[PDB]
Homo-oligomer: A and B are copies of this chain.
Amino acid sequence: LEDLLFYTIAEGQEKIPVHKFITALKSTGLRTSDPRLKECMDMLRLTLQTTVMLDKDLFKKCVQSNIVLLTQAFRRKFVIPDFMSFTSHIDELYESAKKQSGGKVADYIPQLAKFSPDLWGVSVCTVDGQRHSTGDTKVPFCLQSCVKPLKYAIAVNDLGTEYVHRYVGKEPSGLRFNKLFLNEDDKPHNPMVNAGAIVVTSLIKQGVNNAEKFDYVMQFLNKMAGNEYVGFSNATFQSERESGDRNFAIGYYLKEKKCFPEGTDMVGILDFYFQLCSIEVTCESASVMAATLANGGFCPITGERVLSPEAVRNTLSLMHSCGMYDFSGQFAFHVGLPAKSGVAGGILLVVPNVMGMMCWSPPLDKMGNSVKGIHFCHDLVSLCNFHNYDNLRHFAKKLDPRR
């Protein structure tokens, strides 16, 4: 194994230069900081202080702990084998959406209004841990409604579908009912609207205070993002709470109609709910969260199982049909990917079995969705055969980046 891969990377010459190995490694799309590569990069750093050039036996020493993963990377066995070609396509789509500079930045609170209209970043993480970022991908921003699927998933993971769906429905309202809080069975319509998300919030880690509930959720997001940036915006929390009249309206109505688990402190659930909307990510950390969803609940950069299959399948289903506000039907039809948008300008996107993305540009269209994000998501499915109901064999002129 260690030896066979030596012959792939050497191919004549009995010594591999270190940079040659690293630069072939990066070109698969793995980063050198990948947690699954640490034994190998540790042994490499130590070799460079013990002697820029590797024999068979020294290469064996470095890679033998991580050899299964390096083999797949070098045998082009990753989900996207020509990743360099792919990223060049992402970059083109990025540049094309960059010309769409209309929309209006959200301003209802000071913290959304301050963000520049020209911030625009796209991050990819495949289900094999291959990474790409273009534009403003290391700039923190609040998840807002992008957190709705993540706390839904956490709820289904801990409690099961059956319990969760005793409290929250499973369908879009339909466009003329995007301002009823309840369906005919007196449940919120689905987890992706505010009333539904407020009830989901009330299910998570019952019988502990908000500090522990918050810490428990944050632990969960950490694992989903493979330990990348997950932070918190107190400024955003305070504004959300000092101006969430509509969500307070939702909470009293739900209390009235008995929508909560017994023993619920509705006013504290609203506090929890605003906290969760204020959790901060970057394009890069969030792309990994989306890839966990794309990868059956396994984080692709650590290999850790974070969510049950049930949790992930339910979440992708509801993101497909209810994920993009009143554009949910049009998006399902034209893009046909699980996606969730937010008022900060994020679009969490999942291509099941392939990758997770986060697109972010603050300016929103009249439905609440990032203009550039929406433009990018249309272009991505125009280009690649990723639509849910694209055929994997007969896909016309679309490119299939899995071949």
Chain A residues in contact with chain B, CB under 8 A? 127, 169-177, 180, 183-184, 245-246, 248-253, 255-256, 295-298, 305, 308-310, 312-314, 316-318, 320-321, 329-330, 332-333, 336, 338, 352-353, 387-396
* Distance between A2 CB and nearest chain B CB, rounded to angstroms: 24
Contact for A252 among B245, B309, B321, CB less than 8 A: B245
Residues of chain B contacted by A316 (CB below 8 angstroms): 388-389
Complexed CA–CA distance, A333 and B246 (Å): 29
Kindly name the residue among A184, A310, A352 whose own CB sees the greatest number of chain B CB atoms within 10 A: A352
Kindly name the residue among A295, A297, A353, A389 whose own CB sees the greatest number of chain B CB atoms within 10 A: A389
Chain B CB within 10 A, most for which of A295, A317, A330:
A317
How many chain copies does the complex carry?
4
Query: Which residues of B have CB within 8 Å of A174?
Result: 171-177
Contacts of A183 in B (CB 8 A): 175-176
Residue pair A330, B171 in contact (C-beta under 8 Å): yes
| Contact residues in B for A170 (Cβ distance below 8 Å) | 329-330, 333
Find A249's partner among B171, B253, B332 (CB 8 Å cutoff).
Answer: B253
- Can you list 19 A-B contacts with CB-CB less than 8 angstroms, sorted by A residue number? A127-B393, A170-B333, A174-B175, A174-B177, A175-B183, A177-B177, A245-B252, A246-B256, A296-B393, A297-B394, A298-B393, A305-B394, A312-B391, A313-B390, A313-B391, A316-B389, A317-B332, A320-B388, A320-B389
Q: How far is the CB of A291 from chain B (nearest CB, A)?
A: 12
By CB atoms of chain B within 10 A, which of A253, A255, A305 has the most? A253
Given known A170-B329, A175-B183, A396-B310, contact A389–B245 (CB-CB < 8 A): no
